[PDB]
């Protein structure tokens, strides 16, 4: 059966920890991959964790210099949620250095980009069979969401970027039906930057929250229906979500350019005028993580919020964060439940090692009593390599 | 398709060894988890072993100081019975430092407690989906059975404790239907201590034998129906149950306080006025194990018994002990078969290592010819690390 | 649907290699068990290899002194045919130091003996549930076939021995229906010895060829119907079967006491008056293996034969040998196909190591063109331990 | 339902990266086999990778001298596509040093040759059961395709060679129906050499492209219907196929003998008069790989082509190459899709190691936009052994 997306998003007041993966603690002795960008996607029977292996095992000589991110060895794989990425319990999905995966209620769809920086090619697979193929239209690094896409009524929607990472790029929205592209629309967004977007279906409509890697320290968004009729803007809130970001002050609808020249992959949930902002705790480095509920944070420019929940302590390393969705066909409720994941990066950029790998944690929103704590990666670096 | 639980408990005269796990012998070279409290639960198709990993492998540098029991890295996992807990053959269940799991004949229910000591939160999962959530009441260490619960007619019953571990705590009984809490009742038991209960169904009723960690050297019990109408007391037999216990003498129906200040998790089966007491051979440390049949132990205060069976030698290390049952929907008989498991702890508290891990053995009650022997953990400590 | 054993045994003229296990070559780096007596049993869907793990991994410090054969750590496990006995791909069956397993077309039956020498107890499991239990009746040592048993209709037939290994013991035949013993008969065989039998069904009758560890260098046999009406004797051929055997000469109908004081587990197939003898190439040590077709070997005492096939070279180590059967419900033919397995022992009793482990090979009987070769264990001893 | 063939080969204009396993650069730490001659075969549900293990793990003392390609330890195994060949995730198929496997839409058929050089015997298995067995004729090294065969209307067709590898051999075509050899025809091809052929079905007929190991630097071919009515010849193109080959010039319809003393396993697809030649970039050693589209290459002797795609760089090691097919019963299209695989050999023959192992990559043909790149093996030799 298909996967309808006509039911609105569940209102939540807290987040309960779903899964925790101890990849780097177990990888000092066991055989686990050196992974990056570990997003989670769910199916009407189970939820899988998708990661981008670098072709090497942890605590090995082939994990040297894994700060590189575009090599002919990166592959997309998947393992059951909560389990370490290992060669003996992972499933091969595609060969890619940028990827995304979804389930339309019948079969898995995976998009994977692999090729030269000028002329990369995206290969679409439906049930493990190549169905369609895209090529770069502006001859720069072609990127995908790095997260799961949104599938509504049997059609799955993704966003791809092509162009400079510090200038004006080109943005495209795709509608995919059973692995074949049936409609693509190029966004007309001058003075905007969309990159590594997190998309969820709400009311037969798709909402994506992206990162501005050029001149924005808040987060842009785009919303479109099944005919790809889009609306663009930024999240107007004093609770900035990007990293690096300035200290909290009055935001604006336009790209706020105070400390916005890079970013980290993030997300947010729209609840009318409110937002559930998930950001780090350090305005300079990727340290800590927290959840903030701003009652009027989607259109009102002030730094006042209502609820804050602690997820990772301010002294513990953090990284990419994205959002996934559990449909009523799986949970059994009458609405769509929001969930999210966080990646805990530990390695070369900020520590004196030769590699770079990240563990993951996952939370799901509930209407019950929840507590805030710190669930970090308890690895003891450096390793023996 | 759901478990009825309306049959009486099978009368037995002996115990036949069901499974044995050589986790620590194999973990010196292989990749196995550092586990603790490995209870067992059965389903209408198979029986699983549930353990609480610390997030590190045996013979690894991350197994240092695993005598700690409440950390953000402890997770609940499960593996098929008789198999070593390994990253490559285990299934992730929940994130918890105190957990219990059950099967109501349709789907698996797992309760998992994780959070701060003052404010811990229990997350209930039905078929891998978060369904309900509980929070601590008295803001002390919220703890659960550490063993499987009892499911009768589609409802599963558990007991949770909240308060001092050497004083008067608060005790609660829960009824769970398809992951949602339907009814909770707070026990009114002055001068009692209930902790780490082992519950089994018998004639549509639930009986739990718990651990008195405050002033009792015998074991308390509680019995309730599906409406949570409870009866409380102590197992008044001269054959004491806890590990720090006096030499055998006339017991009492109230808490006997001679050597009882820090118990160990155990069990017992009621057969009218009789009991099947499972205890350790040493009254000082967790060494040895045996099963004793007292014909009038549940109500008569004398130290005379009838049958004793040897399960672990007096010079071999022992640990936690709990009880599980096999329903007629699985065995095919007309009554509920009693079974139990023992954990064999090897590590820091009594040996000169840096870690603490435990293997397990299992026994099933039969009406045939059985022998008493010693089935210890044949590990040779210390390890390389 | 249950297995019927009414179709006669297939006439064959050669043996084609079925599977080969490189357990010891792979176990120098990988994690494989230290196994012994690796028999094979088939099911209407697949064939499994059953072995007796000793609780330790190969190339490990717990492999010291594995020449011992009765310890509380030995367990019966199973893995798919042709695959190494690894902890990550094996299934736990029972706790035993002497075991056998069978499939009656519906579910797996496993018998496992574990306990003291004087008082060992056999635990019968049907579909993983304990169903019946036997105790030693002469209180010396309780042994089983170490191979698969014969299943006709829903009943499976095994032979158990109890008594001296160098004197006169007591012999019993069991009929098992759905895990429960329905009829047992004690053999009256003065001046005979049956220790490790290989049983196959032919025409709704069961024939077992056993080991004489007291008198004879030839092999005894027993044949019985479903009511346990047995016939006893010895294989009257000049082509002797046991490993400590004399040079070929005229055989005898009773125990030939020339070099018969020990023995090795073996087999033979009856074809009227003919036999398919599987023996070792060395009359003093367990080296080499071959299959010999004697047209009148079952009753005619002469050393002349017709066909010989080489399976292991005379300079390569060999060991236990047994026979299994592929029923028409699996192969699809109209008769029962003969098959056999060989164990290749490498370790302490003949080499300068600290351990003792064995690999396995399998052959199937065919009416096509086949070749004789040597398929030994290519391990390079000693290891690094 | 059985595969039908019955449809023509899909016209393609490019090749999309399908799978890639990083076996050699994961086996430096993990446990992977020392494999050689991989190939991929697809079933109506999944595609498997078949390899010929040498009985030893990578980075182990038993990897010494893994260049002897005919030993009694080589076995045929299979693992899911894109996954490393490991003892814990691969299935045993047969014992062979020369093998091929196929799926007729119902069950897997595997052919495996193992035995002496003069007297090797091929064992045919259907659904894991030995069904037929065939023996050598000219008492030389009996070879099979080393690739998947072609199954049309429930019958699978293979080619075997027997005779000198530098002279005139004997070639045979087999039709196999449910594991039993139905019809065999001996090819009458004087002054031809057929070896290691790659066969695909097209319009209910079989076309095979082989290697000439005696005096040809181009590639021979053979095409036959279901009654084994064959047509023989050579690929008449100036774009030569074998690895030892001269510089491009006008080809010939016979065995062009310039540098044809040896060869490497390869393939080609016929599209009327055109060819899709897959060859290496180095005319002396096995380095690089590319696909070339010659519009009239099958019959027109000129060196002009129209399309070239880069798959491995000229400075990266390459090896065997073969072709497989995805039927409409799996993809869902209306025609047969062509795909191919490449093996990346790294080890003793060309580098200063003690072993020889190869990774693999796979491509499938599409009518979309594709890019040429280099997807080599990123191993860093020598290892620690």
Numbering used by the authors:
A (entry chain B), B (entry chain A), C (entry chain C), D (entry chain D): -7 to 377
From the paper:
We produced soluble recombinant tetrameric NA proteins stabilized with a tetrabrachion tetramerization domain, validated their quaternary structure by cryo-electron microscopy (cryo-EM) single-particle analysis, and conjugated these to Mi3 self-assembling protein nanoparticles using the SpyTag-SpyCatcher system. The structural integrity of recombinant NA antigens is of critical importance for inducing an optimal immune response. It was recently shown that recombinant soluble tetrameric NAs, particularly of the N1 subtype, may suffer from structural instability in the head domain, resulting in an “open” conformation not generally observed on virions. Therefore, we performed cryo-EM to evaluate the quaternary structure of our constructs. 2D classification of the tetrabrachion-stabilized recombinant N1 NC13 produced class averages corresponding to different views of the NA tetramers, all of which were consistent with the closed conformation. The 3D reconstruction further confirmed this view. Collectively, these observations indicate that our NA antigens adopt a closed conformation similar to the presumed conformation of NA on viral particles. In contrast, our NA antigens adopt the closed conformation without the need for stabilizing mutations. This difference may be attributed to the different tetramerization domains that were used. The antigens were produced in a mammalian (HEK293F) expression system, affinity purified, and evaluated for purity and size on SDS-PAGE. The recombinant N1 and N2 proteins were highly enzymatically active in an assay based on the cleavage of the small molecule substrate MUNANA.
